[PDB]
A paper describes a structure:
NLRP1 and CARD8, two related inflammasome sensors, are highly expressed in a number of cell types and play important roles in both host defense and human diseases. NLRP1 and CARD8 mediate inflammasome formation through their CARD-containing C-terminal fragment (CT) generated upon functional degradation of their respective N-terminal fragment (NT) by the proteasome. In general, inflammasomes leverage supramolecular filamentous structures to nucleate the polymerization of caspase-1, which in turn increases the local concentration of its caspase domain to facilitate dimerization and activation. Here, we determined the cryo-electron microscopy (cryo-EM) structures of NLRP1-CT and CARD8-CT filaments and analysed their assembly and specificity.
Despite being included in the construct, no UPA density was observed in the CARD8-CT cryo-EM reconstruction, which instead only reveals the central helical CARD filament. Given the predicted 17-residue unstructured linker between UPA and CARD, we proposed that UPA and any residual MBP molecules must be flexibly linked to the core CARD filament. Like other CARD filament structures, the CARD8CARD filament also possesses a one-start helical symmetry, with a refined left-handed rotation of 99.1° and an axial rise of 5.2 Å per subunit (~3.6 subunits per helical turn). The filament has a diameter of ~80 Å with a central hole of ~10 Å. In contrast, the type II interface is substantially more extensive, burying ~490 Å2 surface area per partner, and the type III interface covers ~230 Å2 per partner. Because of the small type I interface, the filament structure looks almost perforated with visible gaps. Detailed inspection of the three interfaces revealed many charge–charge pairs as well as other hydrophilic interactions including R459 at type Ia with D473 and D477 at type Ib, K509 of type IIa with D525 of type IIb, E507 of type IIa with R464 of type IIb, E479 of type IIa with Y527 of type IIb, and E483 and E487 of type IIIa with R495 of IIIb. While the wild-type protein formed filaments when the bulky MBP tag was removed, seven different point mutants, one at the type I interface, four at the type II interface, and two at the type III interface, completely abolished filament formation in vitro. CARD8CARD did not form filaments until 15 µM, while only 0.25 µM was required for CARD8UPA-CARD filament assembly, an almost 100-fold difference. In the model in which the type b surfaces of the CARD8CARD layer interact with the type a surfaces of the caspase-1CARD layer, the charge complementarity between CARD8CARD and caspase-1CARD is apparent, especially with strong negative (CARD8) and positive (caspase-1) patches both mainly at the outer rim of the filament cross-sections.
Residue numbers in the entry:
A (entry chain I), B (entry chain M), C (entry chain E), D (entry chain A), E (entry chain N), F (entry chain J), ...: 451 to 535
């Protein structure tokens, strides 16, 4: 959960396909449809990553934990890379 | 209802998409169209949160309760995060 | 692993059939099905190579190593050619 | 090895039965089965020659040398004709 | 022309996009550029409607007629709705 | 016509492709080109639905009837679902 | 009909050729041509499945039933697999 | 049924004539004509094997069992070879 | 001409060799070369039938009549089968 | 020329391959390359038809005549169908 | 130059793609980059046309002539249509 | 410098974007930040032009010359138009 | 606390967004809502800074300390810059 | 740090994508979220550059140094161009 | 380097595939990934050319030289054509 | 070279096998591999002809001459037919 906070910049510059994590967050009620659509209407992938990351940090640490779990299963290689550095 | 008052600053710094809560408040007659439009014409999201929060506290505690319910359903994760701290 | 980074342009201009490496990466959980499909829906082979290479560098160096191994077994002649130059 | 590069057009317009060279390249790990099959599924013999030649130049100069050896043994008359002109 | 006067409140609460009527009034010399700009610098749509309506009633009944014509062509459905009630 | 009013929230959360209804409303003079364009320049589909619905309620009940007819032909399944509940 | 809702994620990750179900839905007026085309212009099969599933849930439960019937006849093995788990 | 899953790569690299298994799957309603045709329009035999295998795993484990039976009767030697290793 | 419309699904699932009807339609100016080529570049025969049928219904009923005549002469047995059922 | 105006909806719902008419309009200076590209970047064929039709009506009646001629030669069957109804 | 003034309303309701004329005006020093950007940040095409037209009339008649030339070359059909009416 | 004085009314009714001239005047110490902000807090563009023009005439003729230079470079077309009349 | 007094002019000419400090002062009962509103209704930012600074010095040194703390957290860079000079 | 001051006008007219520098400044506590949002809500890129530059000069020279570093890494070519002139 | 400036309009109307030059500029640190993505998200090829050209002129003349070199190698025929005219 | 321009439509409707001319253009550096691949990924032969012709006209007249030579040798009969008419 904190790991997201210490890795905000790397997560924006590295996270790729957001459809998986967005759907997982939606199904965990972290994000409503409107919130997800707002995330997706950004022009650039770094912009989309910033939108998603900020929207989730504002939700608190529990939701940050849910996001971290969803990334760790949707993209375990990046999570592991960051966590060991 | 009080919970809003003890969490004014956190609610301004955390609340995100206000369209849901604004529409819910409108449909509960807490806010008229003009009031909602005045809330939305602020430049920044913290400014919008301040406008909405102040406009609702002035209405009394019953309306504060309606606002709290609307947040608890539109953004339950932040509500829960705050309530457990 | 680094060797991929020093040879980004050559690898895009030289790598050929990507089905082998894509399947190997999928089976090593570097890429999910969706990610692989996104790689394959590019129009041109240089575009496909760019998509795959960028998608893998973002994953970190461990995944870059997995990709390098998969190329070194799927197309050893190009790997050797580059590595000796 | 270079000789292939200076004679790309002549080699596409002259090379005939590709089964010998394709099998030799396969046994020298220049081409995998999938790569060979992709070469053979072209409609025309000039198309097949183009596919094979491009697929091999991308592999580097060492593989170009292997291809040249295989042609020089599978079709020495054309190789000699070109080399003396 | 009178119809505007008997429907001041409904016209403020119902009229929508004012660009059409403002341009028509400008081209009929009912409003100068400065007057139109003053109408548009109000914060809310009900405020803009009030500004425009008052600014036009002050001009007299002839200008009220011009405004009514411009609404009846720019937004005939609302005009008809009101006129039959 | 009323049915739209009792189902404002459901219609915003359910209505999908608006091109059909927007074109039908345009051809019934409920909406001018400018009004339609203003509806389409919203970021989100719920935002677009809100814009369209509000813009039409302001026009009166006759225009609400036209909108209801256009939905009942462009998307009869949702209309029927709502009407039986 | 509900079965679709409890199996949203599995249905997106499992459903295959959508031409059959799309045509059946079209012939049952669940989807217009435009809606079907919007479903088909997505890049990936999981994206297409998400588009179709969401577009149908919004239509209500009756249309969800029609979709379920069309899947149960177009792809009975997956339907049965899911229903027994 | 599982045996297919543990032997995905070997089954793609080993399975040969698919007409028998495709017809058997068709007659067991695992595959419709359209699905079978989509399998057959791939360029390469490894591509065809991948298409068929993925299309069947998505159908569930029961259909995987049907596919395994059809292979075990259409090509028992490969099945036995794999199963004893 | 109508008979085509009442038998859209059967005609897609039954029509076979389209070269005859495509050439006849071309010679009756129902289809230009480009249109015919677009019909032929579909992957599957049901896809080709759908493309042709839709492309012709859009042309009107006269062209549907021309198509029906061309089928009735190119494949009279299917036409008769359908017409008597 | 008018015929286009009385048949706007039918022309959007019926017109098919637009490459012919777009090229003809380009060569008659009705459309510049940029305008044609803007027409082609729409997602759906009805969207493309709407874009083209609106872009041409705005140009005046002479350009509408040019468009009608180009359709009458590129797709005479639909033109005739509409004109006789 | 005057022709623009007598056709202000038609030019706002008819002019389409403004990128060409905006770039031409920029290269003729009628508009600076900031002015062009201000024109482009309007929401609607009629709004953009109004902004551009007003911004140019204020510049005088010489600049109106430059704008007219740029339209007459970027969109000659509309210019001709208007000029003959 | 005088030219500003003989063209006070035209300059208020014609000058457009003031950001350029305001910044230039600031950098030439004709206006301090406070003075510039006071100019910008007027409601209307004619009001802003009046404020700026009066504030500069009061400064003397040298500052009027600086303002004229800044307009002649920021908006040469209007300057030329006026100067030749 | 004194530091504010020795830096009155610099603090008026440097302090930027006052919303943070105003809210902090309000929550520390240094300023009532009316006082804050009076601060915000000034035209210019230097005027707003003067109003706030004077209103706080009049309150005494304890309130000056509260204001200094709020600036040091809301805008630490300016505070540090001044304090080291 | 000074280099920013001697190049204020060039930096406003040249700086491009501000997302990088804004995020870097945020992470160096030069700018709070509110300040960054205020910078981004300007209409034009020159306006955004002016807002950012002024907001940073007010912070002092240390923050100007941080901004210069962030530009020198986010856009080294422009920095170098200016510094050598 | 200047040659780009004297040929801005021709370069926007002539430059074709931008992937090569964009990648070369990226590898020469003229453009970051975000900048390149912003260039690619434009709708039209002339729009993309304008975005790239403006983004590079702002960087200075050295970067303009890098861009010119990359075009002269990626598309030498157009460069030569322009340079001799 | 011009002859291509006066015969754009005929050349798109007549040119046949493009492999010869594409390879010749590649070997004359008129087209890079990526450009050639982009030409070949069009669906229809008229589309491919349009892509190639436009891509070459943009390159200038020298490249148009190279293309004309390559056609005159790869397909002399069509060239002669057109040139004598």
């Amino acid at each position: 959960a904190a790991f997201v906070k210490e890795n905000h910049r790397q997560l924006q510059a590295r996270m790729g396909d957001l459809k998986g994590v967005l759907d997982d967050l939606q199904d965990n009620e972290v994000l409503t449809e409107n919130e997800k659509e707002l995330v997706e209407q950004e022009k650039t992938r770094q912009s989309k990553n910033e939108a998603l990351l900020s929207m989730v940090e504002k939700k608190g640490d529990l939701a940050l934990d849910v996001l971290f779990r969803s990334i760790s299963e949707r993209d375990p290689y990046l999570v592991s890379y960051l966590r060991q550095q």
